[PDB]
């Protein structure tokens, strides 16, 4: 039935719904179906320094023996400083994105300097860094977390803060390359009803869907909300897991599919 698709693609506009429906009926190809994507928070983990990074380096060097790992980094508080500065000047979201990408790239460099003796490199193009993943003595890579939307970033309804950041930069990379698992390593056991660092009455949440997550009308979340709309619209990755990297083993248990922290499902 590809003839109709081909005769539509050349005639109609890509906004033609008949065309979109024909395209949705096309095949699916997972590029790294055996790979697992994880996101190391910057403000959550790396900005804590040794106590939080060395154990995770150990866990990673241990886990690459059994899993393929795509390790994305967060930006952290340097990015928040930059955002504050630039917003004080009235600069748009694209610039702020240019700026945060760099903090993420910094953190990636620091992390890859710790893993170079273990054969784990830092790579620009994570997705087609094929070699290191085909191997068992490497089986992992570190990149940024920030997406390439440097200046063409979709601005938010209100403000200049880029809504699509490291969280999205990792999730989308997972969804594209058809990875099997997506994990967010942060400074909390998972998602609560409110920021526990501010409100110690907040309640834990082991599992939830996107719709329920919105209905709760959360003022603050452990993930970027746009990631939810992205997850609801994805094809391969239909769930993500958030865990605490300060707790030893949680990451390893999660890579094995175990339910350790919070699980967020599109449906």
């Amino acid at each position: 039935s590809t003839a109709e698709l081909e005769e539509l693609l050349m005639q109609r506009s890509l906004t033609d719904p008949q065309l979109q429906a024909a395209a949705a009926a096309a095949a699916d190809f997972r590029i790294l179906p055996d790979a697992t994507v994880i996101k190391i928070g910057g403000q959550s983990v790396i900005d804590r320094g040794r106590a939080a990074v060395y154990p995770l380096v150990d866990e990673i060097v241990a886990a690459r023996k059994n899993h393929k790992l795509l390790i994305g980094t967060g930006a952290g508080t340097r990015a928040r400083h930059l955002y504050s500065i630039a917003a004080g000047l009235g600069l748009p979201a694209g610039v702020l994105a240019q700026l945060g990408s760099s903090v993420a790239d910094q953190n990636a460099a620091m992390l890859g300097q710790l893993l170079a003796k273990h054969g784990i490199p830092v790579v620009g193009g994570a997705g087609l860094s094929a070699v290191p993943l085909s191997l068992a003595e490497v089986n992992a890579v570190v990149f940024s977390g920030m997406p390439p939307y440097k200046l063409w970033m979709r601005p938010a309804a209100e403000g200049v803060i880029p809504p699509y950041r490291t969280d999205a930069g990792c999730f989308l990379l997972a969804e594209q390359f058809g990875c099997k698992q997506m994990i967010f390593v942060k400074d909390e056991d998972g998602l609560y009803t409110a920021n526990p660092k501010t409100s110690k009455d907040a309640t834990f949440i082991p599992r939830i869907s996107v719709d329920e997550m919105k209905a709760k009308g959360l003022h603050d979340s452990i993930l970027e909300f746009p990631v939810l709309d992205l997850l609801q619209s994805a094809q391969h990755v239909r769930e993500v897991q958030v865990v605490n990297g300060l707790v030893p083993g949680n990451l390893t248990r999660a890579l094995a599919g175990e339910h350790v922290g919070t699980i967020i499902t599109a449906s």
Partner: protein, 272 residues
Amino acid sequence: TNSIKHVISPLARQTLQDRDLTRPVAGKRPIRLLPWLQVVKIGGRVMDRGADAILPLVEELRKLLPEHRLLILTGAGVRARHVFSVGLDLGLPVGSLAPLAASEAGQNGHILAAMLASEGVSYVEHPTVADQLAIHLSATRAVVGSAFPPYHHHEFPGSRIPPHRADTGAFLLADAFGAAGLTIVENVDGIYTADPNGPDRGQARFLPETSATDLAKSEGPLPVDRALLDVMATARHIERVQVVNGLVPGRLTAALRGEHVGTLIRTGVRPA
């Protein structure tokens, strides 16, 4: 013990997800970096016509340079449709197709620039547009570029077709730079109720003016991306966008002067 090392700032200890905490810092309306800029998005269906459509267009542009400071962004056209057909036969995801089409856009741009090099025009890759557009425009008058945005291997899912295409990227630039105007050049007089080159060509009626909402709520096709209508709602500076036919001489020149020669699309921006 393992506490976080923070950099003191208004946004410290924040996730940037709570709007009530960012609004005091980032809730204000931004500025225009290049308010003196005029953006022109040429469609690929135009460049695919070849000389018959490009040479007149090239002369028009040659006559516009001394009048404006121009960023001419090209679109992909039909080759992108071919690469889509192939990638879909192979089952590739939308993020794999986006760059493949961005490239056809870039090639159309290289062409157009070659036809204008005698006048001081050249093609700049995206990085140069982002970091250094002002100096390249202080040197010469116009520069050419690609309109597809670099969502390449990170494009949004939901559709097997990249939703963020030339129109969208052109608008995102123009609204970021705070440009003076965005102008879209198509192979049709403007926007209609239906594809006039399609089956329901007899029921197609020209829309001289409309809003992004009235369209985003419709369901039929369009000569422009539907994501453009979504980013329009979140616009900050651009108030209107004109769609014109470049096969007709003089309409582009007029549009750059604010004349209503095609279709006008009002954004969600409230004027002063």
